[model samples]
Target: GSMADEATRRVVSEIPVLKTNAGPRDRELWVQRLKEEYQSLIRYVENNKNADNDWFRLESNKEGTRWFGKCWYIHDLLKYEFDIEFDIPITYPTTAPEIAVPELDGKTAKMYRGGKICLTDHFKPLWARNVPKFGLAHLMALGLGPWLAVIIPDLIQKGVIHHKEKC
Candidate 1:
């Protein structure tokens, strides 16, 4: 019990508090937040890479402005993997990055012709509030995470997409 309590406390302390406002859009602040968030994302992926239930992996450019990744969904003994991309907007911190799945472009109403995922309605308002605090990692966690949760199973069940054994 003591060790468990200690571990819990340690984890709690390590968690970063989400700031409702990211303050003014200073260049130095933007770059710092971008780098810090990217490093956090790498750690997250590294931690979950081997977990059997995990379904996402991301790779980014050296500048951390562009990210290429994949998301997988397993259902009915089949696994489906999708290629995804995220690019930090020039006005980032003020605007959220656009998430795209090139292969799924124009395939469904949920996405745009050029592949940008439609994250309007529920997502827009919350992202608007977070701004600079909501970096790539937060976008993936709050935006893409929920998008995949809904679309994956729905598409599979509707026969709109097929499952593949390997990505």
Candidate 2:
């Protein structure tokens, strides 16, 4: 994609929040802002408010075990919430950060059995650097989608749908 492509570069560039050489402190701050933005968007949409669907919120573990983001049921709906287990370690537009999800309900997902996601092929390159530029969409596509498509069916079959009563 060309730099002139405002649609692509605008979110990655002019979002004058995280700087180029953002350190752990700066990255943590930016991540918090991203989480806040995600929560705000979810609240807006939950109340039937029209809004852009261009951003994402990282979902983390409730038990304080894993640090990476994961998609889980919120009010019987799928919502992305970021759980920053450790400090973010990268800057913007350089490479993406590492994301991992090991186990779900004492049973590990297919991609994360031994308690670590392998950043081998796609995730390694696409999310290697430039943390500020990347969004949860990229992470979802690279990480969440696969997990949902393959593993979530089993969850639904087992008990994900029965945990809460439908409204």
Candidate 3:
């Protein structure tokens, strides 16, 4: 029933494919796009539910990027499912690939002490890279270094710091 409802919702939301700007047509198109994206995300999660690899799952934070990164998975695993959205830089349409990931407390994530991400030039625009490889690889590399290496470690350290501060 749920699946059927989802499918009906998707169909009802879909607008006939048209290349128009903002208008009733655009609203229909946008709703269709939303349905498609939502279905895709749901499928990705379902297919990867038992996946050994931790690169594809619902993101944890609300209002960040959308990726199957480890931090995203960890938060999902820890029962912190929320919607995160990331903006593509201006260079996206031309030079660099659009980068999106779960937000770090309503902010972009950095891999190291400073704000560094693992998105090598290969992940940039006009690279013409493959989907699965680049996608998963970026997530893993970024997650390990930034999410796991920096954020998680910092969280632990902060706990200690807070304990010390109180004591």
Candidate 4:
């Protein structure tokens, strides 16, 4: 958590940690684990909602492997939203999930062509320091949050994204 800055620390602090370390492959374990996942996720989201800075909305399949969502950033009063997604790797707690914004493909250098957002240079070291305790919410806080901070504003200035038609 020290690796991240104040805002991320605040957000991560509000998110509840998962009780179980189960992955999608483990049926019995994943069932309860998935339940715990949802509770933590819901609580984290509601916390952001209360703060009026709800930057993301996510949902996973019944199996819990395939996750799809939307993450947005409001830059200079223009809201730029992107389609985000990720998969729960087979390695479970050992391997952190990778977040991607499909629509951002080929627009950012650090990311993959398919829009797999890079977590940054020290991300491996940080995640390694505390593996299983970090959940989906942590990814949103530390991963996509930073990416949006760096890339979204650049994109806006370059005119890669635009303000919505809605007020």
Candidate 5:
């Protein structure tokens, strides 16, 4: 007799195998997912209103496709706020939006030439698996949030950014 029970076997059979590749039907699906993601991001910002948390303000482009915003981070008693922007990539839903913090660009190795934060192993595989399920909000919360978590503290520790008393 197998250790695995019949109920476990039955439950496994009920699950559909997820296809990873984007298909013809996915074009429309991606469009819908983007719209939903944009709305979800709006709701997320509204629901989690806090000036000190991470994000303070979010704004979308006239087309409502691209986003520009500001985020706050605290490092060693210092409050740092920076501008960030993300646009829906042409191949979005399959690809997560790249977030950029313009002021921090060229100051750190963790960023690219154009200020795009270099997202490494952490979110890549998860984004690939979730596909349409991941969105701008996810990128901000999980992706940029973690990136800042590492970089901000590092910057303060290195004396690149210093704490100053408010005027």
Candidate 6:
């Protein structure tokens, strides 16, 4: 039920499906799930690096409830970067994590007041169907990836995002 391009299709298939349904409250089970999360995350990172599209960095709290990171879009070969963060709800696996771009708050109407990016119309249904199997990596690729794809270019063209030369 994915509407992504072939490249994204390949990437999504490459990421392993998560096995455990445990949230952070489940202690030992969470450890198992956390391991699965990291494995998928590393695979996603490597895939991006191999393609020279290394666009984000993220790390989670020890409990794996909260994650923070940076993500950037390349427009005109210049960088438009933003801070990204999310929290895994207690009902994770049953509920999707919400990705937030605090840096873009109030700058665009496509986001929540808190700067949480609005996902595509189909994403929630997609997430629901894949619950428990979908993890953070999937959210990044399927959610944030597409959000940036749409929002960044529009912002740049609208003069909302200033292009910064690579350091």
For lDDT, candidate 1 versus 2, the one ahead is 1
TM-score of 6: 0.92
Q: Sum up the clashes in candidate 2.
A: 12
Alpha-carbon deviation at 122 in model 4, angstroms: 2.0
lDDT tens readout by residue for model 2, 43-144: 533432232332234444432222344344332355433222222344533545445544443453444444444344645554544454444444444554
lDDT for each residue of candidate 5 in 1-167, tens digit (9 for 90 to 100): 54433433332232222233332246665455545655767665654564335355777765546788888887655688888998767676677778889888888999999899997785787677666655666677668877988998998888887665677
Off by over 4 Å in 4: 1-9
What's the CA error at residue 106 for candidate 6, in Å? 0.5
What's the ranking of the predictions by lDDT, best on top? 6, 4, 5, 1, 2, 3
Candidate 3 C-alpha lDDT tens digits along 28-120: 643543344445445444444555533434442232222333233343234222222333232221222233333343233343223344454
Candidate number with greatest lDDT: 6
Runs of candidate 2 with Cα error greater than 4 angstroms are 1-21, 25-70, 73-87, 90-95, 100-106, 109-114, 118-120, 128-132, 135-137, 155-167
TM-score to native of every candidate shown: 0.74, 0.42, 0.35, 0.89, 0.72, 0.92
Worst 10 residues of 4 by lDDT: 1-10
**Residue pairs clashing, model 6:** none
Off by over 4 Å in 3: 1-26, 53-85, 88-118, 125-167
Better of 2 and 6 by TM-score: 6
Q: Give the TM-score of candidate 5.
A: 0.72
lDDT of each: 0.67, 0.42, 0.34, 0.79, 0.68, 0.86
Judge candidate 4 against the unseen true structure and give its global Cα lDDT, from 0 to 1: 0.79
Clashes of each: 0, 12, 7, 0, 0, 0
User: Which of 2 and 3 is ahead in TM-score?
Assistant: 2
Candidate 6 on 1-167: residue-level lDDT in tens?
54454545675888888989898698999999999999999998998999899989999987889999899788877877788999888888778888999989999888989888988787888788777888899999888998899889998899997866555
